[PDB]
Amino acid sequence: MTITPQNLIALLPLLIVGLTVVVVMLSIAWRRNHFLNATLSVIGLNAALVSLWFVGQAGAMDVTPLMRVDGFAMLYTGLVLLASLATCTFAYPWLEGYNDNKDEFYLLVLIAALGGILLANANHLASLFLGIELISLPLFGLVGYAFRQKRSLEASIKYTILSAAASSFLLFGMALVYAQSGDLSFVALGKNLGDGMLNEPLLLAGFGLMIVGLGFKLSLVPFHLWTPDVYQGAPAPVSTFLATASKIAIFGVVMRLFLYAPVGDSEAIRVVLAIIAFASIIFGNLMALSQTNIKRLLGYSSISHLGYLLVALIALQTGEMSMEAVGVYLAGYLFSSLGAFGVVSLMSSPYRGPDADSLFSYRGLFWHRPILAAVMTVMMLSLAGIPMTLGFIGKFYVLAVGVQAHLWWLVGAVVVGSAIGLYYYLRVAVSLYLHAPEQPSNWQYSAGGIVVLISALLVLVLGVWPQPLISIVRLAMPLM
Amino acid sequence: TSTEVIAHHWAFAIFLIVAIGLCCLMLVGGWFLGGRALSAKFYLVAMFFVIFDVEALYLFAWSTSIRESGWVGFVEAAIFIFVLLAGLVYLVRIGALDWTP
Amino acid sequence: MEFAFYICGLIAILATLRVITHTNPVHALLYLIISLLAISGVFFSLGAYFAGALEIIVYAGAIMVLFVFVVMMLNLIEQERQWLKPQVWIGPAILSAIMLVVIVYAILGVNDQGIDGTPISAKAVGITLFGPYVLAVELASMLLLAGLVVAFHVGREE
Amino acid sequence: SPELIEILLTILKAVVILLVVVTCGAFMSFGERGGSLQLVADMIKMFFKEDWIPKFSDRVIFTLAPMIAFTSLLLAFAIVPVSPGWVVADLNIGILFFLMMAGLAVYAVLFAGWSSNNKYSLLGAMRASAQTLSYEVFLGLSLMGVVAQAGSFNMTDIVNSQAHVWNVIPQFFGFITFAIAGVAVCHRHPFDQPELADGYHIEYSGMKFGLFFVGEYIGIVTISALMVTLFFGGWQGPLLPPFIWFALKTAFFMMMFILIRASLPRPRYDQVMSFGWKICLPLTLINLLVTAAVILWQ
Amino acid sequence: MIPLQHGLILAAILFVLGLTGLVIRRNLLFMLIGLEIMINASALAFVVAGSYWGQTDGQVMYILAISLAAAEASIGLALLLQLHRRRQNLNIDSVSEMRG
């Protein structure tokens, strides 16, 4: 179908982020002002949130053969925009320490937020492919923004090569699916198969290649080995943006793809995803056991948490509360990873140069910064799934969805990986309250501080009192 | 398949093979007969050429169907070309397209 | 149309096989350009005239020019020829062969009424591109802008 | 059978066009230089001269570069309609095929500079390649003005669309940009030598050097003929036969290329890139936008 | 007259050739070359699928694929230039210190 004016009234966050990109780019062309360009970026993202409120006043409609906007799309757009705003806030002291061009970071962050919005509203293979490329290539720039740093250059090369390979896999799978189906819409992926012929091998192999690409993008085992190196080498605000925004947007569009594809309830893909979720949970938790680096540990943690998300995804068609469970888990994971990588960001800010080490050394953090130690402990307990935190609420949701769909192997995997997670997360927290042997003053560093405190307060409040977030996620139903 | 289209296919193929054979025979007769006895700005320029060439391909695809796209397509190409010009302006002011500093 | 398709496919396969095993970078890029020309011929055999014109104009005429430029300014592992001895490519070759045989098992067994070869002109592709594909076009310009920004940020000399 | 003599007549027309183009390129090498046999004299002088490939060079790349410099624009001629019933290939893509050949033409300069085992020739080749990319980047859009007015990529359709008003008047900016881009893509004056940087035609001698020269003048023939076809109505004329009108317009543009070489001075390298990008690319984008607005209004 | 199966198999052959060329080479330049081979094979498969159904969507996906290929080639060659100018060595196994 074509474009109506009301379709333009169902498109505002995309236009706002694009116009922010153009305005920030022209402002860079005017002059190289870090403060003004960063402020223009954050006002553009805040205006995109307000535009989300305005389109929430509007209804749900199919804006293109490509795009579909409903409350599902607004929820994922809001998560992506909050992740981007936190990334800019953490990036300002980091880029203050960076003795080179700084506003290109904000341009790429905004472009990646645009790709995340596209993935949040994608209802088509072309839009999914374009959104994946639009969050990937700015991350090529951002992961190696400090390319003179040897670790950041290593992470940039690794992520660029491996994501180009995964994009090739995903594109080849999309081509095979289009060869079978004859239509790139999500709802037609298996429409021309009937009488139990849903298990056609070309459709399954195309979906397998797409699964390879997406599971690379979601750090799923065995496409997971890039995660600790890329997480450790990348700049800490870039690690925050990757871990939150990229995984949330790609898992949202994966949720939509498995929701409206008629091939989504094939047993073969369900079994393969169950094996991947089992391996992801167990392998990430086991590999994070003996980690002294917080960024690599959080990479393995991201692997395990995406395994839990996959467990919630498998119970889509059998159950009913699966997408609500995914929304609640995504909110809790977003706030938890935001706070965690935010503390990693502010203790690594300002940027000390390509030659100086960016080692964290969280041991004894309480005796020189108590409040960040408290927020790090709160997010460590949240990612563990302790009941006083919203990470437990997500764990409870995915456990309920696995019990309802009788996914007992995945439930046992959740319990065992949770115990291993308890070991390494509690080791990190008690190390924060240990004694360190031996070893700012602006307001943007204070802005990052209040961002991580706000995330802690939200995760604690919605741990004790989860009903507002549950009722927020429940009303975000899509066009079935 | 009309007679004219296969005649033109044959003529185009003969044009190809006669041109390539004439060049190869020219060099063969040249060799056989006779008596024996960097800065990074280059990469940036080529890269800009590649990116703006892909944008040019999009404009190529628009240009051949103007009467079948209407004013909506003109608007679509208008934001397209505005973003292209914004990128070109960005490259000009940051010194990317400045061979001599 | 089948004749040109099969010779161009064979030329593309052979040229790619010379690409992945050659030692000289300029020679490998020349074989890659040959494979791209063959792939464009395949596109012209199918009736995707715009795709073949773009395969010559954009892939061989821009991207491979960029690769060639980088190789010339490098003025370039080569001596030992690690990838030639079977003890190095013993694993990856059979791994790719297994992946290929699974993929072509999936290919064999689908509905195949054949390709008519009727030319889908660039005008119809433009109508589709600037009809039901507005956001693909705008966000593809957006993506190319992102790639331009990244490649200038990384690749400048200073 | 009428079909066999028809296809043989079409093949003969194509071969006649190809021979006329090659002889026109060589004869205008002489014309840029009564002495009708002078061209034959240098032709057999370079033919019978010994050939020298550098010993520590790459043989295949060195031999391949003049072949590209010849055959690229020689094949690009094949879309040009000379008169009604005298086209070689009436392609659906047309000007896209010209853009394909112009894209492949840069490999001649790059390959010659690399294969010539000389850092100065290599640097000169990179400079010339950067220049021709900087003008190839807007060559296609400078022709897209005419394509947008005609609504098709075909050349006969463009000439038939020029039946009342030649496109030199509405597409005068497209005229100017395609003229500059055609001159710059052919590596001739004032874009002839952009060069620690020497020429990339050094170490080339004999028949390879002759290939480079005749390929440049064949490119001049092709660019002038496509110039006439796109912007000056092709073969359309009131009194003389269409072949005659096409010939006079093509000769008109070819001696004007010679006059531009003989008159205009050489701008600087950075000046050439700055002019190319900063002026001609936004000018061409604006020209296509204004063209689209004009045709959609009418 | 041309089977869709044969074009899909040709694209698969080129894809796995690009993949093994990506794996077996220590030089980063040949890794980027193999990546270009794989993405060109995927674009070819999309063209074959679009031409089989008589749809324009295959060439549109081809255009998106080559836009991606152009941008990735640009970024990868920038990273290769950075690696060569900071290490004077294109060996990808030397860029391996982050581990554990």
Ligand SMILES: CCCCCCCCCCCCCCCCCC(=O)OC[C@H](COP(=O)(O)OCCN)OC(=O)CCCCCCCCCCCCCCCCC
């Ligand atoms: C009676 C049978 C039926 C009922 C079963 C009930 C199951 C749940 C209740 C029992 C749980 C038993 C757990 C046993 C291990 C407890 C943790 C422990 O001892 O940790 C200490 C040890 C670290 O020691 P340290 O020497 O400091 O480490 C080296 C570095 N310095 O830590 C380590 O070395 C690493 C610890 C990793 C995390 C703990 C191990 C988790 C394994 C899965 C637990 C889930 C249950 C699996 C089945 C159990 C048997 C039935």
Ligand SMILES: CCCCCCCCCCCCCCCCCC(=O)OC[C@H](COP(=O)(O)OCCN)OC(=O)CCCCCCCCCCCCCCCCC
């Ligand atoms: C001869 C034996 C082999 C010798 C060595 C290899 C030489 C090159 C071989 C490949 C190129 C030529 C292939 C043969 C083409 C002959 C003409 C032909 O078959 O045309 C058919 C068709 C005509 O169009 P259509 O209207 O669809 O007609 C179908 C029925 N009416 O045509 C089409 O639909 C499209 C025609 C093909 C596309 C244009 C040409 C592409 C050229 C690619 C060159 C690749 C690089 C070659 C490198 C050589 C050295 C390794």
Ligand SMILES: CCCCCCCCCCCCCCCCCC(=O)OC[C@H](COP(=O)(O)OCCN)OC(=O)CCCCCCCCCCCCCCCCC
């Ligand atoms: C050094 C040598 C390198 C390799 C050189 C080439 C090798 C092969 C040589 C033999 C080719 C024989 C001719 C092939 C068929 C020609 C006719 C043809 O392609 O017809 C198909 C199609 C017709 O379409 P149309 O007429 O517009 O629409 C009506 C449809 N019946 O028309 C089309 O699809 C037209 C578009 C395709 C035309 C391709 C022409 C050749 C292109 C490659 C040039 C290479 C230059 C040298 C290398 C450059 C540097 C690497």
Ligand SMILES: CCCCCCCCCCCCCCCCCCCC
């Ligand atoms: C539900 C959250 C539970 C954990 C909260 C962690 C933060 C609480 C506020 C800070 C408390 C710090 C106490 C430090 C005591 C150190 C004693 C050392 C000598 C024995």
Ligand SMILES: CCCCCCCCCCCCCCCCCCCC
């Ligand atoms: C390395 C860590 C391994 C952890 C394994 C955890 C296993 C937990 C227990 C799973 C039990 C599953 C029982 C399934 C029964 C299904 C019966 C179906 C009847 C129709």
Ligand SMILES: CCCCCCCCCCCCCCCCCCCC
């Ligand atoms: C027949 C007269 C028509 C007059 C109005 C023409 C325009 C109406 C429709 C405008 C559609 C604009 C779409 C803009 C999309 C921008 C997408 C940007 C993504 C970042």
